[PDB]
Amino acid sequence: ATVTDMAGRTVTIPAKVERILLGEGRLFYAVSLLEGNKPLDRIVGWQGDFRKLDPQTYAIYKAKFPQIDQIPLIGNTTDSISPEKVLTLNPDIAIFGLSSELVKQLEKAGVPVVFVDFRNSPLKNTLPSMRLLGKALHREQQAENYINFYQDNVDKVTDITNKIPEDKKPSVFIELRAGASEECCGTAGKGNMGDFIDQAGGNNIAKNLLPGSLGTVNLEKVLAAKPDIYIASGGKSPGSDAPGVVLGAQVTPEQAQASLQKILGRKGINTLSAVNTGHSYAIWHNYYNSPYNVLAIQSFAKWFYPEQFADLDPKKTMDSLYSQFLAVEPSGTYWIEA
Ligand code: NA
Ligand code: NA
């Protein structure tokens, strides 16, 4: 009747769970893997990040499930946020990610809160987080099915990259949300997408530069590091006015390609040998906090070692993920090579 969550807390869970509150909206990605043909049936409220920061995925779900507009928004980042203290939603359980006003309110109101992590250390925590969600939401078989699918598809990569000597690995810099913010070069260090670089057999030039999983590295250090390979992450919508790489469920190959070229033309960045010699790529940013991240691991590996991964097709992996676990068709563009 309890779960131990990813924070190590022990939480009593009701035997029946039908009203789930998503404390971070993009935790919907993880919950979608357990819900089969009825992805929205048990969501009684969600934080605004899914609709506001992933409008493309929201659009694809809305087309198939019009009742998505009836799910109330919480957390004051959109309005639509009709709940403030109005959590008369009668939630059975709420899910958050490891690191806040809403957690404190729920705990005193007696609603069980469960923490997961796909962001800090996805190498260690992606599969435990899915088992925990399967237990807390009473979808254990679905969780086990996904754990096996994920591990099988990571092993396709590590079967090869486990054997590669360290001094034969390309150096890699990933610029998260490239071109979106003012100060340049948010990146991943000891965790987050750094974990994907590691598993794909690359050498993350930021790993020794940051104390934690996410942070900023100044542009002068990126240039001085002279990375073999450059990766930009982003998730902008086609025709958006804010700068950044354009990727997601409604993005075509041509649009993605055209936005990456612009990102690669920024000052400083455009002096990198990786930019000018054909070693530049873009990845969908939301893989930085999603159990779908095996698609980024496979894409990284195929970019780093094209010859050794000629038989590996991340697009087919994504086709399998959707047909086995989801209720929508795959669409759009989630990675691209310059
Ligand atoms: Na989805
Ligand atoms: Na590692």
Automatic annotation (TrEMBL):
Key words, A-Z: Signal
Keyword Signal: yes
Domain Fe/B12 periplasmic-binding: 19-312
Pfam families (alphabetical): Peripla_BP_2 (PF01497)
Disulfide bond annotation, renumbered to this chain: C184-C185
Superkingdom assignment: Bacteria
UniProt protein name: Solute-binding periplasmic protein of iron/siderophore ABC transporter
Organism annotation: Yersinia pestis
